[PDB]
């Protein structure tokens, strides 16, 4: 459902327009060839024009398949890669990986296999592409093409760039709608923050902090910010759309109430990965509760309401009694200086609630005052039933340790300590992070499961399109596949030839 004249909207600019971009973009290999989706594709396309370089791209592709390969099949795939890319007489043999490392990689296969067998070589390969090959791509027409894509990326976003549909959810500062990008057809969830209520509450720094944390996070298990633009009477945040409902609805309206342990494991595993991605930016969530975990069309989850998120300065703690009653960690209730520990408390609350069908400190059929709930969170130890395996009791007990100093995942090791807990003993995370594990529930598509002083503030909020999400949108909608064309027989097209604009 793209616009009638979308090819004119996303029409490449002439290379002569991107000179100011050429001189300002940092020439970082990892950014221009890996992180940025369109740059990564263009560089790979460049290597596919040089017989010498192509064999290296295929090798890395096979290593990625090796990491997610099942354990019983690790040995099988490990040999295919060796006798194809690493034998000296191959049509796809890679020479920049030292013959010393080729003999070292072979011995490890004579021993038992591990998912990180080719990590030594893979890094040796990237080191080669970091140099000469990367610097030729920079003086190639594929980097010029990349500059054109960046030029489109930086274009101004307005109300006309989108097409609003329905009011999905509602909240405090405003509402949440469903926007579509006219040129691409991609659907989003336009959260509308009324300018009026922000100016009065004076939550300028509160709305900006949410936008800044969302644009800086790049995770498969957290809502991603795609556009941040300004309209009259309201600001907007274009985020990932989630049509599968929230976890609260699935625990109580679709549940026993509750899930099987194995089903809760999948959701807990994906939530743990989301929190790990937030903690990489030293950002704490503090709002972990079932209604904030949303499901998508495929059945995977994402963390949604980042309105209470804060970026902790490294080496510094924060103070703040915030959150929802019954989902506040003891250090939060007591209003102490805490770090990221409130999130591991919340994870324990969710695993328990998913498995048991009720909060660990308030029964589903129980009516108690907010003060009694809080006393339990600070003084009473939770109990477990026969729905919990011993491993499940363990992780829940550790994550619900009232002393944040002894709570799981609150050490210097971080989320890694929680991933090796026996509760995830059968969870291959590498495959989960690769989206290769089928969710336990797939929602049906047709289903429904529910003043010049204020100008400086809008300047730093209405930043525009976010780089990585925008490029991914270009790829999913196949706009990149269609427009990324060149001259017949590997020759310069008109838009990339400075001779005849």
Ligand X SMILES: *[C@@](O)(C(=O)Nc1c(C)[nH]c(/C=C2\C(=O)Nc3ccc(C(=O)N[C@H](C)c4ccc(F)cc4)cc32)c1C)c1ccco1
Binding site for ligand X (CB under 6 A): 168-169, 171-176, 189, 191, 193, 223, 239-243, 245, 294, 304-305, 307, 448-450
- Nearest CB to ligand X, comparing residues 44 and 195: 195
The length of the chain is 501
Contact between 301 and 295 under an 8 Å Cβ cutoff? The reply is yes
Give the closest residue to 495 by CA, choosing from 4, 77, 15.
15
- Nearest CB to ligand X, comparing residues 133 and 244: 244
Instruction: Determine the Cα–Cα distance for residues 273 and 435; give it in Å rounded to an integer.
Output: 12
Instruction: Determine the Cα–Cα distance for residues 372 and 452; give it in Å rounded to an integer.
Output: 49
Spatial CB neighbours of 89, under 8 Å, sequence gap ≥ 6: none
- Nearest CB to ligand X, comparing residues 299 and 493: 299
Least CB distance from residue 190 to ligand X, whole Å?
Answer: 10
Instruction: Determine the Cα–Cα distance for residues 487 and 493; give it in Å rounded to an integer.
Output: 4
Per-residue DSSP letter, 83: I
- Nearest CB to ligand X, comparing residues 78 and 174: 174
- Nearest CB to ligand X, comparing residues 169 and 493: 169
Least CB distance from residue 288 to ligand X, whole Å?
Answer: 13
- Nearest CB to ligand X, comparing residues 81 and 176: 176
Instruction: Determine the Cα–Cα distance for residues 41 and 137; give it in Å rounded to an integer.
Output: 12
Least CB distance from residue 290 to ligand X, whole Å?
Answer: 13
- Nearest CB to ligand X, comparing residues 69 and 304: 304
Q: What are phi and psi of 66, to 5 degrees?
A: -70, -35
* SS3 (DSSP) at 206: helix
- Nearest CB to ligand X, comparing residues 176 and 350: 176
Instruction: Determine the Cα–Cα distance for residues 407 and 395; give it in Å rounded to an integer.
Output: 10
Least CB distance from residue 145 to ligand X, whole Å?
Answer: 33
Instruction: Determine the Cα–Cα distance for residues 340 and 409; give it in Å rounded to an integer.
Output: 9
Cα angle 89, 92, 96 (rounded to 5 degrees) comes to 85
Per-residue DSSP letter, 318: B
Q: Measuring CA to CA, how many Å separate 130 from each of 123, 135, 136, 150, 401?
A: 10, 8, 11, 21, 46
Per-residue DSSP letter, 12: P
Q: What are phi and psi of 242, to 5 degrees?
A: -130, 105
Least CB distance from residue 194 to ligand X, whole Å?
Answer: 8
Least CB distance from residue 234 to ligand X, whole Å?
Answer: 10
Least CB distance from residue 193 to ligand X, whole Å?
Answer: 6
- Nearest CB to ligand X, comparing residues 425 and 446: 446
Least CB distance from residue 445 to ligand X, whole Å?
Answer: 9
Contact between 224 and 465 under an 8 Å Cβ cutoff? The reply is no
Least CB distance from residue 241 to ligand X, whole Å?
Answer: 5
Q: What are phi and psi of 187, to 5 degrees?
A: -95, 145
Least CB distance from residue 300 to ligand X, whole Å?
Answer: 13
Q: For residues 347, 353, 359 and 363, what is the CA-based torsion angle, rounded to 10 degrees?
A: -170
Give the closest residue to 391 by CA, choosing from 356, 419, 426, 423.
423
- Nearest CB to ligand X, comparing residues 36 and 240: 240
Q: What are phi and psi of 178, to 5 degrees?
A: -130, 105
- Nearest CB to ligand X, comparing residues 307 and 409: 307
Least CB distance from residue 198 to ligand X, whole Å?
Answer: 10
Residue nearest ligand X, CB atom distance: 171
As a whole number of Å, the CA-based R_g of the chain is 25
């Amino acid at each position: 459902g793209k616009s009638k004249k979308w090819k004119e909207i996303l029409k490449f600019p002439h290379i002569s327009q991107c000179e100011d971009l050429r001189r300002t973009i940092d020439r970082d290999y990892c950014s221009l060839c890996d992180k940025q989706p369109i740059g990564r594709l263009l560089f790979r396309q460049f290597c596919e024009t040089r017989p010498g370089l192509e064999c290296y791209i295929q090798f890395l592709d096979s290593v990625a398949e090796y990491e997610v390969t099942p354990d019983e099949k690790l040995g099988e795939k490990g040999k295919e890669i060796m006798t194809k890319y690493l034998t000296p007489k191959s049509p796809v043999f890679i020479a920049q990986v030292g013959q010393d490392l080729v003999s070292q990689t072979e011995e490890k296969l004579l021993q038992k296999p591990c998912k990180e067998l080719f990590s030594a070589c893979a890094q040796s390969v990237h080191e080669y592409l970091r140099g000469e090959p990367f610097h030729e791509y920079l003086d190639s027409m594929f980097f010029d093409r990349f500059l054109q894509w960046k030029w489109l990326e930086r274009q101004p976003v307005t109300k006309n760039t989108f097409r609003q549909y329905r009011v999905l959810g509602k909240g405090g500062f405003g509402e949440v709608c469903a926007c579509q990008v006219r040129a691409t057809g991609k659907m989003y969830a336009c959260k509308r923050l009324e300018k009026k209520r922000i100016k009065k509450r004076k939550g300028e720094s509160m709305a900006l902090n949410e936008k800044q944390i969302l644009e800086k996070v790049n995770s498969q298990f957290v809502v991603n910010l795609a556009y941040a633009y300004e309209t009259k009477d309201a600001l907007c945040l274009v985020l990932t759309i989630m049509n599968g409902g929230d976890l609260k609805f699935h625990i109580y309206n679709m549940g026993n109430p509750g899930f099987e342990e194995e089903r809760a494991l999948f959701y807990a595993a994906e939530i743990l990965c989301g929190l790990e991605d937030l903690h990489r930016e030293n950002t704490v969530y503090r709002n972990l509760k079932p209604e904030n975990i949303l499901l998508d069309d495929y059945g995977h989850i994402r963390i949604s309401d980042l309105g209470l998120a804060v970026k902790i300065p490294e080496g510094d703690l924060i103070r703040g009694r915030v959150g929802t009653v019954g989902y506040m960690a003891p250090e939060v209730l007591n209003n102490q200086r805490y770090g990221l520990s409130p999130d591991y408390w919340g994870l324990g609350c969710l695993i328990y609630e998913m498995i048991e069908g009720q909060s660990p400190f308030r029964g589903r059929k129980e009516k108690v005052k907010r003060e009694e709930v809080d006393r339990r969170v600070l003084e009473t130890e939770e109990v477990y039933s026969h729905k919990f395996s011993e491993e499940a009791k363990s992780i829940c007990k550790m994550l619900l340790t009232k002393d944040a100093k002894q709570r799981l995942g609150c050490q210097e090791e971080g989320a890694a300590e929680v991933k090796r807990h026996p509760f995830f003993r059968n969870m291959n995370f590498k495959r989960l992070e690769a989206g290769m594990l089928d969710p336990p529930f797939v929602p049906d598509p047709r289903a429904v499961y529910c003043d010049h002083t204020d100008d400086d503030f809008y300047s730093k909020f209405s930043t525009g399109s976010v780089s990585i999400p925008w490029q991914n949108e270009m790829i999913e909608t196949e706009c990149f596949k269609e427009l990324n064309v060149f001259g017949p027989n590997g020759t310069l097209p008109p838009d990339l030839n400075r001779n005849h604009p």
